[PDB]
Subunit: 465 residues, 4 copies
């Protein structure tokens, strides 16, 4: 059972909007909104969305496997060895948020301070003492972006596995000689850094010049979660505020996906007339180029929605019914909707480019969709005895590592998104710091009343306690 | 009673090293070490120090007032009006960590997310609704370093007050016309930005080309806290590890200050022979140029300690008894002392240039000295009823603001370093995030045994609770 | 008669290698090498070439017209108005080296000091007094690369004409309103700057993602000059030195073009066995990425000449017979051929990226191919009476402008590549400064003996005369 | 006889303003203006000046020797060895425009293309074959400003000699070991680069924080050329146009120097009332910060001429009689004087920061003062037989080098400013390219009528001849 199986199972349920049913439903962890900082929903005047992995949640592992297969085929196309074709995507290996070290070719799981929690070279998981040869302080400088790449998005899951497949393949292929920083093949040297850049380039190519989007839209039931409660929630948001879309994707793709997401024989509720997806939005903006969007952005363009091409020129007019924008900046949204940052609840899947910049640069309120939480919550509640024992051992050595390994393996080979044993990951720290609210799906807002006050306990410093 | 009065009062007490006396002493908040992240003291192999406001704690308000007076005299010297000479330093106005907005000439107290807690134009404290004209989202982008300057150090306290004095003076002087971004005087326009840069330049000048250091060292009893327990603690650190000094100050000043700090008729304990201050350090490094020090640093030089000048050339030799270094980088310390970052407890007063970079760039463990905590703890414990009522009101509007104001004014006109009412400051958030340990004085380590385990409770995410 | 008609006419002639025939042939201006700085051919140990417009001279106006047509079709494809399709390339309008001013939408012909010689807005040629409204000093700052783009290459000829066509079209189309910096269409504003960037992007697209290369190689007799004397000259160069190719083009295109250039039923001389084009080169390097090539360059790769793809890895081996390189830097050439810069005569068409950087960064000797000189020499010699009269008028006002216009129009609407009347262009100054030798074709070297000393008179300063 | 002896000798002569006397006087090379590009004086509407080495020509070698002595004393003060005090300035060694190579510690004389003409390590002049070990192509990349420093100004003459003294001293001092890139002294390594930066820092310090200006103004007759014809020329310029001063120096120094330059018992002519120096200028601007001045510059300030300090604020008013400006940009001059660039003849001594940027960035007309030409012209005319023989040998090997050495030594150990033998220097090329007019003194303009047309012959390309 993948996290998207859980989401689709919940998506198939119709919405019982009786008040008591809702309050009972929201008490379950799976349908709850989690609160890092208090948020008064009645102060929210605008709801903003990205599309990918927020409105359009791609099914797992089918979508990762398609991305992986096309990326592999691209690498072979540009001259990587034929043996790459025998790879097959394995969802049990990657956890999101790992760091690829382009110097030594390792995947690292780190805490918020760059301390190493897990280190794997290919499929070989390196134990602590052996990690000290390459990481003398068991520490990396995350901000050294020339050396380290953080595989932060769900789109990075296939390449997370592919990097490990490639390091494993070249390590064990007798044509190559393993070196500290790459692989020797006579008079050719492939550094881990150049191999990584080839992988990154191929993933970009598959998304923007290859066939990934085409294959997705030709079988949307296979690749995209669909929930009849989505138009219901959006319709309820539009009753109390304004609703906008700000997506990095282009209009043609956005139109295909959003049309599928709204393709029911009804509108917001069963029995109601169907409405086009655009009618749910006060403002639609594509080609957003986030995170630059939250700074100076790009020039504001208008989409010709008949042709899918941009009209000629910078758009200087006002907000008009039916207009679709391209580029611009977050100030475009605020100006046209008459919003201030703290009036906006912005809902995204990208802990950096959506959530981090919108919070740090503009003071928007933030809702982070974490799709994998739909399954991680089940592992967390079912194996609570493991974690409880771990807490007891901490309060009370080899037992601690054994329980830590057993707990971590329930989530996969790279453990929970949020921790390794008792130590929290970088990703966990960033969620807590930048996501005011978070949940496995933004649909969980449907189960809270219009003016709900989401509450978090006040933080005190140690000397204040 | 200033915070340095509290520190000097504690400094005058002799050290009772009976174990039971120590455990009783450390339980009082004033002599305690506070813990943000657990730290096993037995894993610490090196203790590192900055000098200013750590080893050499300058007395308050005498030192701020000297800095203020000399800065004012410098501004008048370069042509500011004579009326500046009637200013006098007022310690009740500034709190550390305020942000000067060079566009609108305001001092701002902000939370960790850039939300406005306090806004003062000169000495006029602007209430919420009126702040929205200049801050529509009641929010600033802290990283806009061209516009905002964070007055983060204790050396910034005089200029924090001076900026408010200047805005007040020009606002109410009939020769000038107040504009949104500065002051008009016929055909001259002084922007708040240019006024701020003049102030910054004058503070730098007083420290590095004026008479501040000379006046300090000619009356060290007036200006510098002195504690006979300092050589005792340093001697105990050297028993279990190595000890280093890494200061931005030059050697001549460092020698004068450190000689005063160790000028007792005894060594570590009463009855023991006096030892020179340099003998307490395995490595002494001046002109450190932090924060650049924690990156590539500068070339390593050797100080001629006879003349106080740098020897000619880059120093290429090994660690030698009696050598004094200049410049270099944090890798110099690690290499020469044979330390890894997590072996080092680095003790500083600078939440950014000491603590933040040493943690983020090198993985050092950190101890933050917060001198004002010596007095803030007394206000916190004496007015706990105010804060407790505030918590109750929050859980249960105009009453909340009234109690918030009354609580804040106990600390001064700009409130507590750590909060305004129930809302934590940026500074508080940075302390929690980057200081593993913190205290009003590093001397509080004297009251914990050699292998003490400082403990902090594990953090859980909302969905993990 | 175009300049490529002249070159092809000379190309069709067989090489008479009798010494007296050669010395007689080289005395004609059309077959001469022109000398800016003295160059002893016997000191030249390596001959280097770019390919495009040097070895492969594209026929005019057929090739410009193809580039123009495909660029126009690309612009219409992305949404420019259908009327663009009625444009047709006109070789009489553009002269190479004009500057597009993206602020005001003008094409400028300038001298070496940025002084304006010609200013055209669309097809309207602006006279001096009217140019002062937009250019008060009749001067531009060439180095303001954000505002000015110098259309320096022969590949820029179609877009030089296209920019003028577009400014003319939008100016006279009643749907648009002409503004100082662009065109208004209701709520859309197309600045000249954004229009220019669309044009630049479309030209790049046609060359690298569109059909330009495909259409070229499917009719090479239509598009590429072919000269049986080319293998003869290259074979003679290889007798006395080494020969290399360093091209920005990729291997597949290079192979197609070079195979055509050598496709004769003979080798160097008639009667000799045909040899593959690669056998004429000691070193072949593609994807050169000049001008970066003459600095740090890029990593050295090896081409798999069977597949046309790059082999995997950085190439670390030595120079080998049959190997083809990709990327690298100019130091690669010098190292592998054992050459110093002044040993190399580098032959190119690009006054900046070939010639300027190779001279300024590496001290190479330079030969500039100027294809248009093949026709400009005929205009210069046939209308020498116009220029002679102009010189006399200068030595001796409205007559001077009238003769200047009449002389300039013999070359086209934008005048000679090298001057407007008595004033030299920027391009002329750059040729004199950076091209040691220059000619309409590098084939003219065939008519000089192996050890010829090309001589230029010494320069004296005014006070030295 | 130094060049300033020649200038002072000419300065002592009174001005005979009879027309025939002037035309006879200007025909002598020493009182002539030399012309690189034609310039119609009647089109000049503004005359602009820098002060140092233009209006205020410092006497040689007295001023260089003072600069040298104070720089040496500063280096010893910061810890260089006492033996530096035995150095004494030697005017026969340095020629202006040499390049210090901070990698290998050499002074280089180069041509316009970076080719090596002379190479000296300390006082050892390295012959061609031995230069190839460090300069394999006998070539340097001038634009590598991290490695090469061009000693372009007359203020650089003392440090040109000092660098050679230092390399010589450390090379031959037995305490140090000579290495390729510097000097070893046990555990200290002084690279040539760090030694150079110490020298540069000390020269800056002497000018801006040391006693150079004080010693200059306390004996201006010793250090500054004085010419009663200066107010006559400036008065004649003001009759036909506007006159401005734009100096990098501060007001207090400018006032002292300019007061001395005008201290005669008469005004423009003998018998006329004396006028203050400021009355000769329509605009006076100090602290110009050229070359940045010719770009965005700095904020415009007003000088309080009573106190010599800047008034508070940016100056926003108009041009007023008696006002003195500070900072600003070249656009300040053009705006306030109502000038376009080609209306301005700007007169300076700095081939880069005055002349180059004013020409390249603004299109000003330029007059370059070359003080050493006052003596170089005498060497050139007296040894014309050497150069004539050299030309004949070139047209017609070991003889050529022998005559080249003999000719070069007449100018000093580093030869003529303008050439080594038949090869022109970089400086010569820059003069020809950026100085429209040039002369040993700008006073030579006095001998040409108000509307004189300075003529240079038109340049033709090789194919145009």
């Amino acid at each position: 059972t993948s996290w998207s199986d859980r989401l689709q199972n919940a998506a198939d349920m119709p919405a019982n909007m009786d008040k008591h049913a809702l309050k009972k439903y929201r008490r379950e962890a799976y349908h709850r909104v989690f609160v890092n900082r208090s948020l008064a929903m009645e102060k929210i005047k605008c709801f903003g969305f990205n599309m990918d992995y927020t409105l359009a949640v791609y099914k797992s592992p089918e979508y990762e496997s398609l991305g992986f297969e096309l990326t592999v085929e691209r690498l072979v196309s540009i001259g990587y060895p034929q043996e790459l074709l025998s790879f097959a995507y394995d969802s049990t290996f990657p956890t999101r948020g790992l760091v690829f070290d382009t110097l030594y070719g390792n995947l690292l799981k780190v805490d918020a301070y760059g301390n190493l929690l897990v280190c794997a070279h290919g499929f070989n998981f390196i134990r602590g003492p052996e990690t000290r040869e390459q990481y003398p302080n068991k520490f990396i400088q995350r901000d050294d972006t020339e050396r380290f790449y953080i595989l932060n998005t769900l789109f990075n899951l296939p390449e997370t596995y592919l990097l490990a497949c490639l390091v494993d393949f070249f390590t064990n292929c007798p044509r190559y000689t393993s070196c500290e920083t790459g692989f020797k093949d006579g008079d050719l040297f492939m550094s881990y850094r150049s191999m990584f850049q080839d992988v990154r380039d191929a993933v970009d190519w598959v998304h923007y010049k290859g066939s990934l989007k085409e294959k997705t839209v030709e079988n949307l039931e296979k690749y995209v979660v669909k929930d009849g409660k989505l138009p219901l929630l959006l319709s309820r948001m539009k009753e109390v505020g304004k609703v906008f879309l700000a997506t990095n994707s282009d209009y043609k793709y956005t139109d295909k996906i959003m049309t599928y997401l709204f393709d029911f024989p009804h509108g917001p509720k069963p029995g109601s007339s169907h409405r086009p997806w655009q009618s749910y939005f006060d403002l639609i903006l594509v080609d957003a180029r986030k995170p630059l969007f939250f700074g100076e952005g790009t020039v504001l363009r208008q989409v010709d929605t008949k042709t899918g091409k941009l009209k000629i020129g910078t758009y200087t007019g006002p907000l008009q019914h039916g207009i679709v924008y391209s580029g611009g900046s977050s100030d475009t949204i605020c100006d046209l909707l008459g919003a201030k940052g703290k009036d906006i609840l912005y809902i995204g899947d990208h802990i950096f480019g959506d959530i981090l910049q919108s919070k740090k640069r503009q003071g928007w309120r933030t809702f982070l969709v974490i799709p994998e939480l739909a399954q991680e919550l089940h592992v967390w509640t079912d194996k609570s005895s493991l974690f409880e024992e771990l807490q007891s051992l901490d309060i009370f050595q080899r037992r601690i590592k054994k329980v830590t390994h057993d707990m971590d393996m329930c989530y996969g080979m790279m453990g929970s998104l949020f921790r390794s044993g008792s130590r929290q990951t970088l990703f966990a720290s960033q969620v807590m710091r930048y996501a005011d609210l978070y949940a496995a799906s933004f649909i969980n807002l449907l189960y809270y009343p219009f003016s709900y006050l989401f509450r978090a306990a006040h933080v005190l410093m140690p000397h204040e306690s």
